[PDB]
Amino acid sequence: MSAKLISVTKPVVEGVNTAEELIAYAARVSNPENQINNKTASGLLKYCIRHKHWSIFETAFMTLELKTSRGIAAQVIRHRSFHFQEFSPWWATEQEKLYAQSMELYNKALEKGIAKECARFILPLSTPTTIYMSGTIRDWIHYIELRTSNGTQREHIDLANACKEIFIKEFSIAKALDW
Amino acid sequence: MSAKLISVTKPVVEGVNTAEELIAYAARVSNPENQINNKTASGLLKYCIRHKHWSIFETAFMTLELKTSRGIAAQVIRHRSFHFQEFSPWWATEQEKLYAQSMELYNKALEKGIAKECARFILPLSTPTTIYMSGTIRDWIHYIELRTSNGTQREHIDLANACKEIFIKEFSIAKALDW
Amino acid sequence: MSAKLISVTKPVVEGVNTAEELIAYAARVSNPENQKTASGLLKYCIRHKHWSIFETAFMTLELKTSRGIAAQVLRHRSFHFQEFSQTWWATEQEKLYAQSMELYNKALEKGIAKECARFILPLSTPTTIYMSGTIRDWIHYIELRTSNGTQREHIDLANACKEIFIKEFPSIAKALDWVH
Amino acid sequence: MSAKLISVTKPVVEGVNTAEELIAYAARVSNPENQKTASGLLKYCIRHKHWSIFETAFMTLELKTSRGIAAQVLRHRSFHFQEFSQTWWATEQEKLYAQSMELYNKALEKGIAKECARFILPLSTPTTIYMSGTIRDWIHYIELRTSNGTQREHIDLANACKEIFIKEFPSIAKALDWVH
Ligand SMILES: Cc1cc2nc3c(=O)[nH]c(=O)nc-3n(C[C@H](O)[C@H](O)[C@H](O)COP(=O)(O)OP(=O)(O)OC[C@H]3O[C@@H](n4cnc5c(N)ncnc54)[C@H](O)[C@@H]3O)c2cc1C
Ligand SMILES: Cc1cc2nc3c(=O)[nH]c(=O)nc-3n(C[C@H](O)[C@H](O)[C@H](O)COP(=O)(O)OP(=O)(O)OC[C@H]3O[C@@H](n4cnc5c(N)ncnc54)[C@H](O)[C@@H]3O)c2cc1C
Ligand SMILES: Cc1cc2nc3c(=O)[nH]c(=O)nc-3n(C[C@H](O)[C@H](O)[C@H](O)COP(=O)(O)OP(=O)(O)OC[C@H]3O[C@@H](n4cnc5c(N)ncnc54)[C@H](O)[C@@H]3O)c2cc1C
Ligand SMILES: Cc1cc2nc3c(=O)[nH]c(=O)nc-3n(C[C@H](O)[C@H](O)[C@H](O)COP(=O)(O)OP(=O)(O)OC[C@H]3O[C@@H](n4cnc5c(N)ncnc54)[C@H](O)[C@@H]3O)c2cc1C
Description:
The complex is a heterotetramer, with two copies of chain A and two copies of chain C.
Chain A: E1 3-11, H1 19-30, H2 41-50, E2 61-69, H3 70-76, E3 83-86, H4 91-111, E4 128-136, H5 137-147, H6 154-170, H7 173-176
Chain C: E1 2-11, H1 19-28, H2 38-47, E2 58-66, H3 67-73, E3 80-83, H4 89-109, H5 114-117, E4 126-134, H6 135-145, H7 152-168, H8 170-176
Antiparallel strand pairs in C: 1-2, 2-4, 3-4
Helix pairs in contact in C: 1-2, 2-8, 6-7, 7-8
One flavin-adenine dinucleotide sits at the interface of chains B and D.
PDB class: transferase
Keywords: fdts, tscp, flavin dependent thymidylate synthase FAD, flavoprotein, methyltransferase
Assembly: tetrameric
């Protein structure tokens, strides 16, 4: 039900060490005259966000590994600004009988010579999956804010919050956003 | 296992009647001097394609309704240049026993008060689905060429070919592409 | 300065004759319980971020502006474009421009290629471009570029697009309180 | 004319220390049977259109070019950009430019806003921009813009990017027969 950091933008310019520092640096050198540049990074970035100066948040890219189900991943897949890879600052009773029954038929179909990509189709949407999700920091911002809101279903909320915790760790922007 | 036309680009400029005619017209007025403009539309467009002048094929947008399974739709969903909407020129024996068993549990779970979005999760990937797929003619071109190739699985090939037939009907480009 | 409609989405299915009717149709077969007004349904869809019903429609506009403003418009990367080939301050803008066009003409006359001569043209030089995007993309482009912060010439162009948007999508406009 | 690397993807997981190692890692946990050379695996991935392994890496380059070429580069809409503020034919290009810069300076000195004065600047005027995209997007940008058909100044800029790409992704370059 979780997420881990796989990869993130690392700058190689002098005096810019992290992804967040590049975003703040792009903000500042866009408008060198701006008195706004004299703010803390989180102060500056609050305004960049408020002004819709989104391109500074597209200098950075992060990728996360998500562990979720096939039902939720299909929903996550709909955030088309992201890039995905897939691999091969009573109710809980009847499901378990059916799930065990499906995996039995799955494991035996493979053993009987049926390949993989045909056997896959009998698996339920509750089947766990692992995907990479990659996108700019701009896109992570609006995915997280949306999918941690009331209007999205519980298991997606949990998934997005796992992402939120990693985001907060890597990124002044989490304070700018009042997260 | 099929597709239908739902909607397509209709120009409102004078002497340009169809989506294909706008693409050919954009090609021609991009470079009014070009002796290439004296070709038939399919002759002109063959070259636009060959030269990678892709933006003329992004003046037109088409949308199709696809009937397929949840397994295939999840794969189709990965063509992220497209926009999707979802709604609520022995092996064939064991599957049918399990599928009937899942739908029984699905129908009864709803009848027992479980809602919908929880019951959904027990459904197999073989479950039929209806989606809209919308994108520019450029994107339709490269989706169709890819997903009608050897390297993609049979049921996706059939789906892409249903799309191909509609494309051929609406669009000189089908001849330019040697379809 | 101006905008003209070139092309728009038209549904081919029975009972749905306009791009917006298709948008509304999509929002309807998504309402088990909310059957309020037509524009009220769309407003509700917009408010809950169900964007994809608005990505079923697509519209192209021809914009007439300067190269300088066009470069800014090009930054709205969800859109697809097509380009084609061809006070005292107000007084001295006219002399340089005329003097720039004079040399431009001379160079073309004296054999020099179109793409080399183009480089002497100022950012104020007129250009016409197609801008194509889903209805979703138009909403946030117009929204953004009509609000203070963007420069005057750009505000004017975005207000020209908004006028066309409202004619084609009168029910979304109502949902957004957009008026002529 | 030139390009400089600003930033690139670095994996944080054990055993994978570069963007390309992560790309290669992704292509490996996708090979049940093909275990040929490292660059040979990627070539195979590229040939079967498995693009998404190449969308795990992302790189930013700072480009120095003219406004005219930058407007063309802006058309590669899969990329994200950032802009910042600040023969006889060769003889008369120098006079107009100097004369355009003279008035530009005068206008700024006499109170006129930066955004109004900018419009008298020719398309040849220097600019620096960030260009950020997945490794996939770089491949087809470089591929396209290094080939005959695109104009000289643009070919030169795309060859400057290719040089940096090859330094960072030596194994993809090998897979594509790209050399310095
Ligand atoms: C309540 C709800 C109900 C839904 N119902 C359905 C349904 O019935 N059927 C169906 O098919 N789909 C449905 N969806 C899916 C929805 O239509 C979208 O396709 C998906 O949820 C969000 O993807 P997106 O297109 O915004 O993609 P994203 O990849 O997240 O965003 C696309 C681009 O928009 C930008 N963006 C997003 N928000 C902002 C912002 N605030 N400011 C600036 N840029 C922004 C992003 O940064 C990104 O660059 C529903 C979604 C919601 C939340
Ligand atoms: C054999 C194969 C194996 C795969 N294996 C995996 C896997 O193991 N795991 C996984 O997660 N995914 C896998 N995929 C998915 C793949 O990585 C892509 O994400 C998806 O198949 C194609 O989507 P796309 O990104 O090209 O999207 P699209 O929406 O189809 O295209 C994106 C953009 O690229 C453009 N484009 C595409 N081709 C051209 C062209 N020739 N010329 C100009 N423009 C073009 C389109 O027009 C569009 O604008 C596999 C795909 C293939 C075919
Ligand atoms: C000969 C030439 C003449 C042109 N003339 C005009 C003109 O007169 N007017 C005008 O407006 N425009 C013109 N164009 C511009 C052109 O139409 C494109 O808009 C511009 O080159 C941007 O390319 P792109 O959209 O593919 O952008 P990109 O951002 O480079 O690509 C978009 C997406 O497509 C994918 N993709 C591209 N190629 C492949 C591929 N081979 N396989 C898999 N994926 C791929 C990329 O990875 C990326 O994700 C011309 C282009 C050419 C080269
Ligand atoms: C105040 C201001 C100053 C700027 N200064 C600079 C500068 O100095 N240098 C520089 O390089 N750039 C600057 N920019 C440009 C800016 O950073 C963007 O690159 C440009 O405006 C394009 O916007 P966009 O990427 O959202 O494009 P769009 O194509 O308009 O949007 C991309 C996608 O995001 C979606 N989206 C946008 N808003 C929403 C939303 N509210 N809800 C749901 N979806 C949404 C759209 O529907 C679309 O699908 C500035 C912008 C502003 C307004």
